[PDB]
Amino acid sequence: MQIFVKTLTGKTITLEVEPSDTIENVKAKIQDKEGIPPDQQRLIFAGKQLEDGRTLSDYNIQKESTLHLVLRLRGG
């Protein structure tokens, strides 16, 4: 199934996923398409940050849903 991941700009990353994919798998697919390391990615759906160790079906994320990608700013 297709899902969409909008960034801050409003650019869309379109991914092919299964509902059984983990959020960690999704972050890996974003790294393969965009080069963004998973450790910096925060994935938001229904205003909630998703946990890497759970699946899209855990979060009832159905086909053609839109998530939001936030990049955690580095501390210092």
Partner: protein, 227 residues
């Protein structure tokens, strides 16, 4: 209705203003100290200060006597102050930005489809209680606040967590310094000021918040500065 608390961080608030359609000729910057040596380092002019401070018992003591004196004495609030009340928990970050932009809108430049422009257009003649309800119902700002709440160098807390920190805005309107806190029944008049000394006059009000709460370090001030 409960929102997520925003990080006191110029990169968070500047990106939030960009999503609301504000053109970036004004940008928040950090304020590192309150002595004039440090302040003379913030780019000029400054048109607003946002102050994060802790809601302690000593605060809410000064807070309740400040209110009752103004109810009796009846201060100086021109009708051209834009003031809105807070009726959403943890919305103070957005209300602070709105207070900052709305009381300076002529200096502000908005972009095509700017959601903040449309909100200020529609709310210009509402009562402060009406503006609070309008914010409750305004999907575009609620959505943008929520994604912005996940930005920053810290992770967003859980929505149920108690928050003991609060944002307010300090601005200059008609030759006076106003503190705008949506938790209070009206703007607070803090004396005389101008566009050219707002930063130093605002920081003097910040100084008083801190000296009332001398053991607390949990303060952050950001300045809305020409860019």
């Amino acid at each position: 209705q409960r929102w997520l608390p925003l990080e006191a961080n110029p990169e968070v608030t500047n990106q939030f203003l960009k999503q609301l359609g504000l053109h970036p000729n004004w940008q928040f910057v950090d304020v590192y100290g309150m002595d004039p040596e440090l302040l003379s380092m913030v780019p000029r002019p400054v048109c607003a200060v946002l102050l994060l401070f802790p809601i302690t018992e000593k605060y809410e003591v000064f807070r309740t006597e400040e209110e009752e004196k103004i109810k009796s004495q009846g201060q100086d609030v021109t009708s051209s102050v834009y003031f809105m009340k807070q009726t959403i928990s943890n919305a103070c970050g957005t209300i602070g930005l709105i207070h900052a932009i709305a009381n300076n809108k002529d200096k502000m430049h908005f972009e095509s489809g700017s959601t903040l422009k449309k909100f200020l257009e529609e709310s210009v003649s509402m009562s402060p209680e009406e503006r609070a309800r309008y914010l409750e119902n305004y999907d575009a700002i609620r959505v943008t606040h929520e994604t912005s709440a996940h930005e920053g160098q810290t992770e967003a807390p859980s929505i149920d967590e108690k928050v003991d920190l609060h944002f307010i805005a300090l601005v200059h309107v008609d030759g006076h310094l106003y503190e705008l806190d949506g938790r209070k029944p009206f703007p607070i008049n803090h004396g005389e000021t101008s566009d050219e000394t707002l930063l130093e006059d605002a920081i003097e009000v910040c100084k008083k918040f801190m000296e009332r709460d001398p053991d607390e370090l949990r303060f952050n001030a950001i300045a809305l500065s020409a860019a």
